[PDB]
Structures are given as C-alpha cells and as structure tokens.
Design a protein. Structure first.
Ligand SMILES: [Mg+2]
Ligand SMILES: [Mg+2]
Ligand SMILES: [Mg+2]
Ligand SMILES: [Mg+2]
Ligand SMILES: [Mg+2]
Ligand SMILES: [Mg+2]
Ligand SMILES: [Mg+2]
Ligand SMILES: [Mg+2]
Ligand SMILES: [Mg+2]
Ligand SMILES: [Mg+2]
Ligand SMILES: [Mg+2]
Ligand SMILES: [Mg+2]
Ligand SMILES: [Mg+2]
Ligand SMILES: [Mg+2]
Ligand SMILES: [Mg+2]
Ligand SMILES: [Mg+2]
Ligand SMILES: [Mg+2]
Ligand SMILES: [Mg+2]
Ligand SMILES: [Mg+2]
Ligand SMILES: [Mg+2]
Ligand SMILES: [Mg+2]
Ligand SMILES: [Mg+2]
Ligand SMILES: [Mg+2]
Ligand SMILES: [Mg+2]
Ligand SMILES: [Mg+2]
Ligand SMILES: [Mg+2]
Ligand SMILES: [Mg+2]
Ligand SMILES: [Mg+2]
Ligand SMILES: [Mg+2]
Ligand SMILES: [Mg+2]
Ligand SMILES: [Mg+2]
Ligand SMILES: [Mg+2]
Ligand SMILES: [Mg+2]
Ligand SMILES: [Mg+2]
Ligand SMILES: [Mg+2]
Ligand SMILES: [Mg+2]
Ligand SMILES: [Mg+2]
Ligand SMILES: [Mg+2]
Ligand SMILES: [Mg+2]
Ligand SMILES: [Mg+2]
Ligand SMILES: [Mg+2]
Ligand SMILES: [Mg+2]
Ligand SMILES: [Mg+2]
Ligand SMILES: [Mg+2]
Ligand SMILES: [Mg+2]
Ligand SMILES: [Mg+2]
Ligand SMILES: [Mg+2]
Ligand SMILES: [Mg+2]
Ligand SMILES: [Mg+2]
Ligand SMILES: [Mg+2]
Ligand SMILES: [Mg+2]
Ligand SMILES: [Mg+2]
Ligand SMILES: [Mg+2]
Ligand SMILES: [Mg+2]
Ligand SMILES: [Mg+2]
Ligand SMILES: [Mg+2]
Ligand SMILES: [Mg+2]
Ligand SMILES: [Mg+2]
Ligand SMILES: [Mg+2]
Ligand SMILES: [Mg+2]
Ligand SMILES: [Mg+2]
Ligand SMILES: [Mg+2]
Ligand SMILES: [Mg+2]
Ligand SMILES: [Mg+2]
Ligand SMILES: [Mg+2]
Ligand SMILES: [Mg+2]
Ligand SMILES: [Mg+2]
Ligand SMILES: [Mg+2]
Ligand SMILES: [Mg+2]
Ligand SMILES: [Mg+2]
Ligand SMILES: [Mg+2]
Ligand SMILES: [Mg+2]
Ligand SMILES: [Mg+2]
Ligand SMILES: [Mg+2]
Ligand SMILES: [Mg+2]
Ligand SMILES: [Mg+2]
Ligand SMILES: [Mg+2]
Ligand SMILES: [Mg+2]
Ligand SMILES: [Mg+2]
Ligand SMILES: [Mg+2]
Ligand SMILES: [Mg+2]
Ligand SMILES: [Mg+2]
Ligand SMILES: [Mg+2]
Ligand SMILES: [Mg+2]
Ligand SMILES: [Mg+2]
Ligand SMILES: [Mg+2]
Ligand SMILES: [Mg+2]
Ligand SMILES: [Mg+2]
Ligand SMILES: [Mg+2]
Ligand SMILES: [Mg+2]
Ligand SMILES: [Mg+2]
Ligand SMILES: [Mg+2]
Ligand SMILES: [Mg+2]
Ligand SMILES: [Mg+2]
Ligand SMILES: [Mg+2]
Ligand SMILES: [Mg+2]
Lengths: 136, 78, 386, 59
RNA sequence: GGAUAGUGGCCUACCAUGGUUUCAACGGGUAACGGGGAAUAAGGGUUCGAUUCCGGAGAGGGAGCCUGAGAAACGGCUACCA
RNA sequence: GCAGUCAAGCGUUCAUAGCGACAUUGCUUUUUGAUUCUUCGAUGUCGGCUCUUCCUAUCAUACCGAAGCAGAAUUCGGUAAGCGUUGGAUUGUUCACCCACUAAUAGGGAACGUGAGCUGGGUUUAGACCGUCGUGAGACAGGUUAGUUUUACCCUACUGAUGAAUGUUACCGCAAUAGUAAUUGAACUUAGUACGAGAGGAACAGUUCAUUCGGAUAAUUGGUUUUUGCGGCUGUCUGAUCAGGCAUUGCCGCGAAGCUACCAUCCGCUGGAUUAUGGCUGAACGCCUCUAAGUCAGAAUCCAUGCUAGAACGCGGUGAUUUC
RNA sequence: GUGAACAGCCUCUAGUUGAUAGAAUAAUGUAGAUAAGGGAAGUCGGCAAAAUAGAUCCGUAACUUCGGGAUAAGGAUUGGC
C-alpha cells in the first residue's frame, strides 16, 4: 500500500516479514525478491515489519539478471502462502510467496506475471490487472 | 450464498467453514476442515479413503432408489 | 539514564485493580439520559450468554469494497426469557449523592427470586417476605402510601426485576434480581407503570428494537493467578535468563525506593466486570417461534440451537438477543444488556441489517450439517435406522 | 453467454476439448478439435437464460 | 515376441560379450545445409556456393496429435516455455 | 551545553522577516574538569536486554501568531510532555556510520534507574601468542585468545487473596476517594479546483480503509493433543487366534473439548470549562486601544459524562430475625 | 529375540519392587515436547534448539607430501507376502 495505489486495501493478514525471500512472478529477469522494508508500515519496538498482499515492499534481487542485483527496488506482493481471511469469510492461502518488480507509481517492469494473483492486489494496482492472467 | 463441496471429501462446506487453497497452476481446492485438507496435503487418493463421496460413489454405496423405474413422461400429438 | 527506546506502556491503567469482581452480576454503573416525553419502559435487561454462531448477510456500506456483497460475521446469542417485575425503588437527590428512599415490593414472589435471599434454601423455613405480603391484606394503605411517597419525592425510579431461570436449560435454580431504571414519563407515571406490572412479565421485544446499538455489562471469564507475561502482555524474556523468564526484568528503579502501582505484577486474571458498548442487535427472536434460525432468504424451519445443542449450555427455548460480534462474559453467565447512553449515527449504526442465513451446524466439533434432515439427506440410510 | 452442455457436471464453468458430433462446437476443418469453455449442467444463479420444454400442460 | 505399411536393437524378455580406432575412432570446432555450380584464365591449383534447378530441414522454441491416400502439417489442432 | 541584552553589520533596497559583530548579562548539571565531604571490617565495575515513572531546552501530532507566507513548501514564534518517537548492516560497545521505513524516527533524569532481574561481548586476577621496552624477573590508558556471575522463607513496597469486631443474617443500592485512553496515517471526493504568467498546487464538510494502543471473546481458521479418542507402524513378551503388556507418554496419521493467536473475531462514549491566539464593548488619555471594570470565541489541555475499584473504622433502602 | 554388535529396546534364570505420605494441578520454575507464515531480522556470536544419520546402489571437486581430500558434495532405493 502507498504511493500510486488507487482504492483501499482492507486489513489482510500478514506473514511476509522483512528478510523473507519470495519468488519473482514477472519476466524482468529476477527470480527472487528479498524483502527489506514495507511501504506504509507501523513502528513498535522489536516488531519486524511485514507485507501481506498488494503491499509495496522495498526488495533486492538475490538470484536473477546481474543488472537487477546489488540494488534496491520496489516490489508488489501478489501471492502469500500465509492463510488470511476475506470479509466474505474465506480462509484462503496461496502455494507460494511471490511479487513483481515495480516503480514507485505502481507501474510494473515485467511484460506479464506467471501464476495466479489475489484480487486484493489486482483491485489495488491498476497496472497489475493488465499484466495479470487469472485473479484469485 | 453458494454452499461449496470439499475437493477431497465432497461434503458441503457452508460459508466460512474450511480452508481454500490456490495451487501453483491456479487450480482451486476447498476443504471443510483440517482433516480433508491434511489428507490432500498428504497426497492421499480420495477413492482410497472409505468415507469420502467420490469413494462411495465409485464403490456402489447407498444408491438404490435414485436408479429405478420412473414416471417422467410427456404430452404429445398436436 | 533514559528508556533508550520508546514503546507504549503495557496494559491499560483505567482497568485497575485487576482483582476478582464483587459479583457475577456486573453492575450497571450508568443508565441512559431520561426523556420523559416517551412512554415508560425498561432501559436494560437480563439474560444468559448461551454461545456464538456465524451468520451471513448482505452489507449496505455505500463506498466500501464489500458494498452490497455478502459478508460472514460472528455473533453471540443470549437466552433472554421475559423478566418479571416484582418491585419499585425510588431514589432522591442529596448533596452527598443519590440515595434510595423506599422499595415497594410485589404481593407474591416466585420461589425463583425468593431463594435469592437465602444461602441454604432447603434447610431454611422459606419465611422471606411472609410478613411483608400481609401489608396487602387490608386495602393495605402501606403500599399505596409508600408508592405515594415515591411520587412526591424520588425524582428517579427503578423497577425490581428478576430472571425466569426456570425457563433456561441452566441448573442453577437461583433467579437473578436487579434494578432497572424507568426512562419514560412523569415520575408518577413511572411508579404507576411499576405498580401495574407487579408480578407481571416483560419481554425483550418491548425493550429492544432490532438493529439497535446496545451495550453489554458482565463479568469476564476466570483464569486464576496469571504470570505477568500473559496477564499484561509483557515481552517474554530471553532463553539464557536464569531464574525464569516469564517475568519483568526491572521491576522498578532504585528511586523511588518502592515498587510502583503502575508496574506490571503477577496476579488474578479474569473475572473482571466490563461494560462493552455498541453491539448491534441482529435478531430479536421469540422462543414460541419455530424456524427461529430461518431467514426470508433461507426459510428452513430450524431454531437457533446448533445440531447437538449449544456446547456447555443446551438449547434456547425462550426469547433471545443476537448481537453482532462477541460480548464480555462466558457461556451460562448472567449478562445485562443496556440501551446505549447516547445517540450515534456513525453510518455503521442505523444500518438496516437483514440476515440471510444463520449457521446451525454442530459446534461441539467440526459440524457439517445444519439440520438433522440435511444430515440424513446427504448421508442416506444407516444401520441404526430400519 | 457461455452455453451449458447437458450431462457433464459442476454448476460452474470448465474448459473441455470438443470434436465433431459434440454440443457447443462446430468444427471448421476435418479432424479439428478445439478447447472451449462450457457451463455446467446444474442450474445456478449465474444463468442469464434457462431453456425449458413443456412435457405436461397445467390449468 | 511386440510394434511398423514393412526390414531392423525399432522395442521387449532371455542370453552372450561384443562394436569403432594412428588407415585418426571418440570428442571439439564451423561467422556449415548438400549438390548443379561461381571466381581466378600456362598447367597443376587456390577460393567461394544463404541465393532462380535437384535433394534436405523448418515454420518463435519444443513435444504431442486429429483428418487423410499423403502431414508428426503449423497461413491444422492440443499442452508447456518465451 | 543552552538562553539573553546593545545593534556596527548580513539580508537587491531594508539594522532586528530570518540573522547578527564588537562587547556585555545569564541559565544548565547526561560534558570535562576542580575539590576530596561520605563509603576501603566492600554500596558488585561497561554495554545491552527488560520495565516503570519523571523532565522539556517539543522531533511528530492539536490550536495559534510571524515571514523577504502568491500556491505548494518551509521557516520563526506562542499555548503545549495529552500522545507517540521504530526495523536492520559493521562495532562489546556509549558514541559513531551507513541501509530502510515513518506523522516523527526529539533530548534528558530516576545511585551516569535497572546483575539475590538476566546476559557477560568489553573491561580488570590466575594460562597463553605477537609487537615495543628491560641484561633479567617482569612491563605496556599496545594488539590477540581461554577464563565458576552465590542466597529471599524476614520486614517493607508492589501485585493479587482471606478476615475478627460495631445485634444476627440476607437482598438491592449510594459514591467519597483513587485510577482512567485512546492513537496516528492513507485514499476517494472536494479538485487539477483556490493561487500562479507558468511550472506547479492545497485545504474545511462527506465517505472507505489503515497504524500504534487497549478491553474482551472462540462461530469461523490456525496452533496445541495423556481425550493416550480412532486408525496405522517397528521390537519383544502372553503357544496360535482374539485381545493385549512393556519400550522415562515407543513411533505415526487424524483428532474433539478446553486453552489460545493482528495467525482469529468483536467493541473502544460526549458534554462543559479554559490556554495561546483573534475579537466585542471601553476607559484611563475629549483621540486611540481585546483590558483597566465587564465581555465573545478557542487546543491532542483541564473538569465533568463514560469506564474500573468501592472507604474492610463512609452510607442508604428492603427481607427475614431462634424458646429447652 | 531384534541387529553389524558385550549398542539400544523386550524377555528366561536369579534378584528387586527399597527413595515419607495424602489431596489438588494457580503463578514462577526444573526436565520432556509441538507450533501457522517467515527463516537468524534474535544475539557479542546460530548460545540453544532443529536438520542430518543405518544399509544397498549410482555420483563425487579444488588441492595433495600421491598416502589423502572422501560418508567429499550429490542422488535413488528399503515393509509385507
Ligand atoms: Mg499496511
Ligand atoms: Mg531489539
Ligand atoms: Mg553469489
Ligand atoms: Mg501489456
Ligand atoms: Mg485442529
Ligand atoms: Mg525518551
Ligand atoms: Mg421509609
Ligand atoms: Mg501457562
Ligand atoms: Mg547463564
Ligand atoms: Mg539492586
Ligand atoms: Mg534380435
Ligand atoms: Mg563389456
Ligand atoms: Mg590427423
Ligand atoms: Mg550453421
Ligand atoms: Mg560450403
Ligand atoms: Mg566442384
Ligand atoms: Mg596460394
Ligand atoms: Mg546451396
Ligand atoms: Mg547464414
Ligand atoms: Mg515439415
Ligand atoms: Mg520470425
Ligand atoms: Mg507444427
Ligand atoms: Mg504464415
Ligand atoms: Mg504450408
Ligand atoms: Mg554597536
Ligand atoms: Mg546597510
Ligand atoms: Mg526591511
Ligand atoms: Mg552537556
Ligand atoms: Mg569521590
Ligand atoms: Mg559500609
Ligand atoms: Mg569502599
Ligand atoms: Mg554488601
Ligand atoms: Mg564502593
Ligand atoms: Mg544494594
Ligand atoms: Mg519584504
Ligand atoms: Mg533564536
Ligand atoms: Mg504568539
Ligand atoms: Mg505525558
Ligand atoms: Mg504530569
Ligand atoms: Mg536506528
Ligand atoms: Mg539488533
Ligand atoms: Mg548488531
Ligand atoms: Mg566513514
Ligand atoms: Mg549524572
Ligand atoms: Mg549504574
Ligand atoms: Mg549476578
Ligand atoms: Mg569476559
Ligand atoms: Mg567478569
Ligand atoms: Mg571476542
Ligand atoms: Mg590474563
Ligand atoms: Mg604495575
Ligand atoms: Mg594486555
Ligand atoms: Mg578476552
Ligand atoms: Mg574454554
Ligand atoms: Mg531468608
Ligand atoms: Mg498488601
Ligand atoms: Mg456481642
Ligand atoms: Mg500510540
Ligand atoms: Mg482528480
Ligand atoms: Mg509568479
Ligand atoms: Mg490489540
Ligand atoms: Mg488477548
Ligand atoms: Mg470450538
Ligand atoms: Mg482446528
Ligand atoms: Mg492406538
Ligand atoms: Mg508385528
Ligand atoms: Mg482369523
Ligand atoms: Mg514385563
Ligand atoms: Mg530402560
Ligand atoms: Mg511425546
Ligand atoms: Mg481446538
Ligand atoms: Mg455520553
Ligand atoms: Mg465543567
Ligand atoms: Mg483576552
Ligand atoms: Mg485581564
Ligand atoms: Mg491599562
Ligand atoms: Mg483526547
Ligand atoms: Mg467509555
Ligand atoms: Mg463498605
Ligand atoms: Mg449497609
Ligand atoms: Mg535359563
Ligand atoms: Mg529421597
Ligand atoms: Mg521418586
Ligand atoms: Mg507428594
Ligand atoms: Mg509448565
Ligand atoms: Mg503434532
Ligand atoms: Mg514456525
Ligand atoms: Mg528456507
Ligand atoms: Mg545473524
Ligand atoms: Mg542469510
Ligand atoms: Mg566476539
Ligand atoms: Mg555485533
Ligand atoms: Mg549448538
Ligand atoms: Mg519437525
Ligand atoms: Mg570437503
Ligand atoms: Mg519391494
């Protein structure tokens, strides 16, 4: 959540704390994303900031095209294996933890994304709905 | 308000009850409880589990009046 | 030195002492303002928390992402069989506070409430109120005078009601008596209403409309002696800490040379009296109504009791209140519902809630079927049949 | 607008491979099989139109 | 024996221990499709041929396959990857 | 370390919007000194962890005044400590230095708070290596490595828990005093609007969500499993079968109930009086002035409302009050 | 008996059943365990704990004093009948 995201994300259960590495679902040349921060996060002594879905994280590329490594870049979470609950009462969880590289406005860097996506993320980032195949 | 069925057990999962799993290939699986979800997560074959619907269905279990002569005819001749 | 890192204080201070409460029946420390333009009626009610269940309904939030979409919410149901008015207490204003002037009582009193005045009911001779009821033998002129006193003085009026515990699956057999403020018209009109209801009964529909924001007052669950870790939420200590770790490391500074009231210490957790507010009423059910759990969209003839009954409580056979969410108190505890102390629009209040389906599947386990019919339908015939 | 197909399963939508002689599919070449989506055969609230035939008149 | 339209380790079961190599196997390279041919004129050669004709291979990369006399076709389908 | 006074100067012009020389007056006791009063028949040495309260010389958040404030931004100042002030990499570190989020990542006190609270990385015994010095033993506000952290049953404090005696016993209540809590952000809309040549570019009302904090609760989901509840498995033992024993709860899958998680759900009230500040009326002082008398408005403040406890030596109403 | 085995676990002979009891099962402990999603962000430091493990088969690097490194690494397999 943050800059350039139209709409409002209901509180979705967390589960991707800093240090977590998630699969890169786009075709930018990166295959993993090491989370290092969470845009729009809280501050509480010793509480590790976490991202849940559609949240904008600051990450680094640990395995991928050398031109994407050794640097920090924004990323948007599209899949999280931690089960959360929607207002419609469903306790759902994906099979992995995945995100895609994006710029601060929210525009992506990859042509498209491989794998399903959560509506909460699509409903939050417009350029994701375009490059996303199947939501939820 | 749809009442779904377990992807393993085949039992009715009312609103809220159970869990939902979105496989990597975007295939969906709905479970009524931790039990069916665990058996599935264990890679157990439902038609080998004596209590699931698709097991009973595949094993001729409890259907004698649903398959019998009926009186469903039509109106004809104009 | 200073704290070296800021963090908010653990626990709320306006909830001290964290001691056991004085009684299971939490006290209603406040009643709503009184507009005498309205008719006389109760301002609170008694019940017993029976349990919780799940409900599905359409959400009317003009601007929410779930607007007009179905939502699944948690709700509690409190068995609230009609209360019975047996007395009226008038209170007068004094420079040292409000004080009770007189307490007129009903002629006859049900044994339910009568045993409340006893601690060993069977051994006793059950002579309570025996001499009192007799001041009614003549025209009586006692009751009339004391009531007349309440009219001339006692600018605030309260009725003495008690629960019909006999009509509840509970086994306690001891009714619950309490004072309820009348928020109707003229003080004379108030006492008049109280007198006219002596030994009579009052239902919940006559005191609570549907969709109303009501507050709940009750004693929370008991947990006994609790370590400072879970009693206050303090951080667990590291593994290598000798002399235990579910504690607070620095109980306080060298100066002041005393442990401070504001420090977190080990003690009694639970059994605290709480006053939760703004619980929207979803359903106001009647016990003499089959299909209690039915809705205009569901329509199946089923009561609210889950299959197998409410775990640890039983069945609901009387009027009941279904409030959105959870309320303080545990299963089988005497609860007091009270009309909120203020008008609140909030766009969340005033929501004309309309249920769609109420869960009735068993709660004593991972239930699958709503009604025994549904169970037999999806399951077929068994060996215990035929 | 997805049409249903009698007898299959699932009052939801699925994707099958259809051939000659099969419902909801008009081949365009000889031996041409195509993968197309079809709605189930169990009525649901998602249906915009229901096809029905009378077998007995009323009153 | 099976499978093929058919021969054949094509494939399978059993069995054996063979098969190629300084007369260069095996591997590597190729800014490699092969050939008819083109360029350079003592001769012997040296260099080139993606490219009008013949043959082969492919249809973004693979694999799979329906129709058929004929396709493992792609201005056919199916799946995966891009 | 912090704050003034005078005002030559800086600031296009202009001393004081924001600054400020020369000088001069002060405050502070988380600097370092200076002293050597107390402790050498011992007051356990730095850091961090944890947790509480306090200070304001206020970083953020509330309301304001000023600008060299057009908008946006920012700066100066007032009332203000009600509230919050974080996640990491190297370092034993305090400090430092980056990375990163954030409304902000403000400074401090509490025996430089906090070792019968921990930890013991550093320092600072005994082993040992190297460098420098010494003939040598040995030495180094030089560099390395290894090196036992004791006791609470007392009193008090604090947290919770019983309790004699005011005729006996019981039910309903009052409310002194004490405690008290909520917090901050984003988006939609306003609105590409106000303002500007332009680039740029707000806010008040409304709505949807979120952060920090708190009190509950267990319908749902997840965790937990001596339900040793059901099934399964290895080894042995009861001749076999059945059914079982033993293997520090033998192992495994499922597993209710209970307990429980921002890993789950629900709830977190509204009146008044003020501050700064801006004003009304209005003298002193025939004019002028928010002030002198009187007076309006107004803040995350304050007092109430609400919430918690109920004085075991504060209290009210009401029931029943014994025969060997 | 299991198994490579004087291992561990169960048994025969022989020998014990000797350790103050009784009732509960608050906090905090000592000792034994499990934990969703993340996976060292904890910390002086992965302290602690977890993970690994037998056997058969395949596969095994730099470097080397040629003796090693090497169970290197990395894999598949295992009951019963
Ligand atoms: Mg967030
Ligand atoms: Mg920390
Ligand atoms: Mg590398
Ligand atoms: Mg595109
Ligand atoms: Mg479970
Ligand atoms: Mg501080
Ligand atoms: Mg009287
Ligand atoms: Mg515990
Ligand atoms: Mg230790
Ligand atoms: Mg001390
Ligand atoms: Mg042959
Ligand atoms: Mg050979
Ligand atoms: Mg050669
Ligand atoms: Mg080539
Ligand atoms: Mg060539
Ligand atoms: Mg030639
Ligand atoms: Mg030549
Ligand atoms: Mg050619
Ligand atoms: Mg070429
Ligand atoms: Mg071809
Ligand atoms: Mg091309
Ligand atoms: Mg093709
Ligand atoms: Mg073409
Ligand atoms: Mg062609
Ligand atoms: Mg001067
Ligand atoms: Mg000048
Ligand atoms: Mg000027
Ligand atoms: Mg200083
Ligand atoms: Mg000294
Ligand atoms: Mg001394
Ligand atoms: Mg000394
Ligand atoms: Mg001492
Ligand atoms: Mg000393
Ligand atoms: Mg001391
Ligand atoms: Mg100017
Ligand atoms: Mg200044
Ligand atoms: Mg000011
Ligand atoms: Mg404060
Ligand atoms: Mg104060
Ligand atoms: Mg920091
Ligand atoms: Mg750290
Ligand atoms: Mg560190
Ligand atoms: Mg540097
Ligand atoms: Mg000091
Ligand atoms: Mg100290
Ligand atoms: Mg110590
Ligand atoms: Mg040390
Ligand atoms: Mg030491
Ligand atoms: Mg060290
Ligand atoms: Mg030493
Ligand atoms: Mg010396
Ligand atoms: Mg030294
Ligand atoms: Mg050392
Ligand atoms: Mg050692
Ligand atoms: Mg002692
Ligand atoms: Mg005490
Ligand atoms: Mg006496
Ligand atoms: Mg806060
Ligand atoms: Mg706009
Ligand atoms: Mg301009
Ligand atoms: Mg909370
Ligand atoms: Mg809790
Ligand atoms: Mg339950
Ligand atoms: Mg469960
Ligand atoms: Mg068993
Ligand atoms: Mg066996
Ligand atoms: Mg048998
Ligand atoms: Mg034995
Ligand atoms: Mg043993
Ligand atoms: Mg165990
Ligand atoms: Mg459970
Ligand atoms: Mg109010
Ligand atoms: Mg007041
Ligand atoms: Mg004034
Ligand atoms: Mg004045
Ligand atoms: Mg004056
Ligand atoms: Mg406030
Ligand atoms: Mg309140
Ligand atoms: Mg008292
Ligand atoms: Mg009294
Ligand atoms: Mg023998
Ligand atoms: Mg002993
Ligand atoms: Mg013993
Ligand atoms: Mg004992
Ligand atoms: Mg324990
Ligand atoms: Mg387990
Ligand atoms: Mg875990
Ligand atoms: Mg991992
Ligand atoms: Mg680490
Ligand atoms: Mg790592
Ligand atoms: Mg170290
Ligand atoms: Mg370190
Ligand atoms: Mg270890
Ligand atoms: Mg494990
Ligand atoms: Mg090695
Ligand atoms: Mg086998």
């Amino acid at each position: 959540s943050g800059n350039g995201a139209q709409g409002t994300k209901f509180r979705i259960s967390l589960g991707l704390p800093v240090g977590a590495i998630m699969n890169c679902a786009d075709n930018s040349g990166a295959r993993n994303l090491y989370i290092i921060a969470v845009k729009g996060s809280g501050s509480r002594l010793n509480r590790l900031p976490a991202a849940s879905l559609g949240d904008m994280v600051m990450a680094t590329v640990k395995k991928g095209k050398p031109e994407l490594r050794k640097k920090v870049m924004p990323a948007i979470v599209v899949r999280q294996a931690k089960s959360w609950r929607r207002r419609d009462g469903v306790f759902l969880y994906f099979e992995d933890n995945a995100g895609v590289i994006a710029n601060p406005k929210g525009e992506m860097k990859g042509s498209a994304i491989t794998g399903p996506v959560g509506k909460e993320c699509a409903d939050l980032w417009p350029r994701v709905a375009s490059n996303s195949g199947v939501v939820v | 308000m749809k009442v779904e069925i377990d992807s393993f057990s085949g039992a009715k999962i009312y609103p809220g009850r159970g869990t939902l799993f979105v496989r990597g290939d975007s295939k969906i699986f709905r479970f009524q409880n931790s039990k069916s979800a665990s058996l599935f997560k264990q890679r157990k074959n439902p038609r080998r589990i004596a209590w699931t619907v698709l097991f009973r269905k595949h094993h001729k279990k409890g259907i004698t009046e649903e398959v019998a002569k009926k009186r469903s005819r039509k109106t004809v001749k104009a | 030195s200073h704290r070296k890192y800021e963090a908010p204080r653990h626990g709320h201070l306006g909830f001290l002492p964290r001691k056991r409460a004085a009684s299971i029946r939490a006290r209603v420390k406040a009643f709503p303002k009184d507009d005498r333009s309205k008719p006389v009626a109760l301002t609170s009610f008694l019940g017993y928390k029976a349990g919780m269940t799940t409900i599905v309904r359409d959400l009317d939030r003009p601007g929410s992402k779930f607007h007009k979409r179905e939502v699944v919410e948690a709700v509690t149901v409190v068995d609230t069989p009609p209360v019975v008015v047996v007395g009226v207490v008038g209170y007068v204003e004094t420079p040292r506070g409000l004080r009770s002037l007189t307490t007129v009582w009903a002629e006859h009193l049900s044994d339910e409430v009568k045993r409340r005045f006893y601690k060993n009911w069977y051994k006793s001779k059950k002579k309570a109120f025996t001499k009192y009821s007799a001041k009614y033998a003549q025209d009586g002129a006692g009751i009339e005078r004391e009531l007349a006193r309440i009219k001339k003085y006692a600018s605030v009026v309260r009725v003495l009601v008690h629960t019909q515990i006999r009509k509840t699956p509970l086994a306690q057999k001891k009714a619950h008596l309490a004072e309820i403020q009348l928020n109707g018209g003229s003080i004379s009109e108030k006492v008049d209403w109280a007198r006219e209801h002596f030994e009579k009964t009052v239902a919940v529909d006559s005191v609570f409309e549907q969709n109303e924001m009501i507050d709940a007052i009750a004693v929370t669950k008991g947990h006994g002696f609790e370590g400072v870790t879970h009693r206050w939420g303090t951080k667990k200590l590291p593994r290598k800490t000798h002399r235990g770790l579910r504690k607070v490391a620095c109980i306080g500074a060298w100066h002041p040379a005393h442990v401070m009231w504001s420090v977190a210490r080990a003690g009694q957790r639970g059994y605290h009296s709480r006053t939760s507010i703004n619980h929207k009423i979803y359903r106001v059910g009647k016990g003499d109504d089959e299909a209690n759990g039915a809705t205009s969209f569901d329509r199946t003839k089923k009561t609210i009791t889950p299959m197998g009954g409410f775990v640890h409580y039983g069945e609901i056979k009387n009027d009941f209140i279904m409030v959105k969410g959870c309320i303080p108190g545990n299963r089988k505890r005497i609860v007091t519902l009270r009309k909120s102390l203020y008008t609140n629009t909030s766009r969340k209040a005033l929501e004309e809630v309309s249920l769609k389906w109420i869960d009735t599947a068993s709660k004593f386990g991972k239930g699958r079927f709503q009604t025994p019919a549904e169970k037999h339908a999806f399951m077929g015939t068994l060996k215990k049949d035929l | 607008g997805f049409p249903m197909k009698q007898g299959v399963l699932l009052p939801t939508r699925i994707k099958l491979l259809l051939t000659k002689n099969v419902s909801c599919y008009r081949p365009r070449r000889d031996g041409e099989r195509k993968r197309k989506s079809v709605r189930g055969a169990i009525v649901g609230p998602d249906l915009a139109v229901l096809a029905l035939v009378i077998v007995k008149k009323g009153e």
